[PDB]
Design a protein around this ligand. Structure first.
Ligand code: HEM
Ligand code: HEM
Lengths: 182, 182
């Protein structure tokens, strides 16, 4: 993924655990060569998976948990590191924001020419609930989506309840979530 | 499960969608024969699964979403229909309540001799987070656990974020949830 994603993981782990711990993790991932991540340069997805895998070990938390946390963190990181207006432009409630996501990622993708963004479809089952379809070229990021949704729930002062009802990992076409909010 | 569970589903649907809708659902589940549910009598689990399946059709919401709602409802229903002091006795925070849950259910099972309660183990990962292990003889109720946890967050005026990190549905030994709370 683009280096932005990996900087943010770095920033999260430094801010929360210090730079020694970050360096430990970076060393463990086999990425000590890399002095800094370049925000708008494409890296191999491996770099991200290795970082999370390395951080699970060092921190003694499962990988899924780090992904959930990173997902929440991202919502705050983007508002603060150069994407705040883009974020604000994408809506001011959870269901509007998720309807606008594919277009948010497309705008980001004018500027990040090799972007492989995910795709999100909403099927609203009422004014306070939806079925959310997450389609990705990648595997293993559902728990990050879960964290992102909670971050968005914070951003909009909205309580969100999320449960995954279909699983791309098991050979189903894609991850599906049922969501209830406020 | 004991008839109280089925009464509560009835009461939720009636109170939210009216009695015609309840009767429709009950009719669709193949349970028109049953004049009323008997609270302290054991029914076949199927009765509950069929009711939820039927309600998903009539209402045009997925089953998992209704389970979430039912879970939340239950916390209010129990406080109001005969179990309020038992509920109050089980604690006055989320993390205490969940440590006490197996004992709450054991109490309930003195009076309900054939109870098959679930089992809950807490691993507190800080003063504001925990990993919750949900072990059941049954399938499909994790999303109801999610709703229950949000109901308890309401009861204790506590903001709760719940994310499921392991799924019995997919072959994992049991459901695990990572929980962040005020
Ligand atoms: C805030 C709500 C958002 C959600 C729920 C979300 C969701 C996702 C997910 C799940 C991925 C993983 C890629 C995959 O699944 O294939 C991803 C990648 C990405 N998103 Fe977002 N996103 C969010 C907002 C943003 C924002 C504001 C930006 C601004 C930079 C952004 C830029 C990216 C980038 C650069 C990638 C990497 C894709 C690549 O390298 O191919 N996203 N997004
Ligand atoms: C006064 C409060 C409560 C009462 C009276 C109560 C009672 C019961 C009863 C009668 C059953 C049906 C078991 C059977 O028929 O074999 C049950 C199931 C259930 N209880 Fe509760 N309970 C209460 C609170 C809670 C709370 C707050 C939670 C979760 C935080 C919880 C989680 C469950 C679950 C998940 C089951 C589903 C059965 C299964 O997983 O095997 N209960 N409880």
């Amino acid at each position: 993924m683009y280096g932005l994603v990996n900087k943010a993981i770095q920033d999260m782990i430094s801010k929360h655990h210090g730079e020694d711990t970050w360096e430990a993790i970076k060393q463990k991932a086999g990425l000590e060569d890399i002095d800094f991540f370049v925000g708008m340069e494409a890296y191999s997805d491996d770099v991200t998976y290795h970082l999370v895998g390395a951080a699970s070990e060092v921190l003694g938390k499962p990988a899924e948990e780090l992904l959930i946390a990173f997902g929440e963190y991202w919502v705050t990181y983007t508002s603060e590191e150069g994407y705040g207006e883009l974020l604000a432009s994408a809506g001011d409630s959870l269901p509007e924001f998720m309807e606008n996501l594919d277009n948010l990622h497309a705008r980001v993708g004018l500027s990040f020419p090799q972007l492989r963004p995910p795709a999100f479809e909403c099927q609203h089952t009422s004014s306070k609930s939806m079925e959310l379809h997450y389609q990705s070229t990648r595997a293993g990021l559902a728990p990050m989506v879960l964290g992102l949704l909670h971050g968005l729930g914070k951003r909009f002062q909205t309580k969100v309840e999320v449960t995954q009802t279909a699983f791309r990992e098991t050979g189903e076409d894609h991850d599906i979530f049922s969501i209830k909010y406020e």
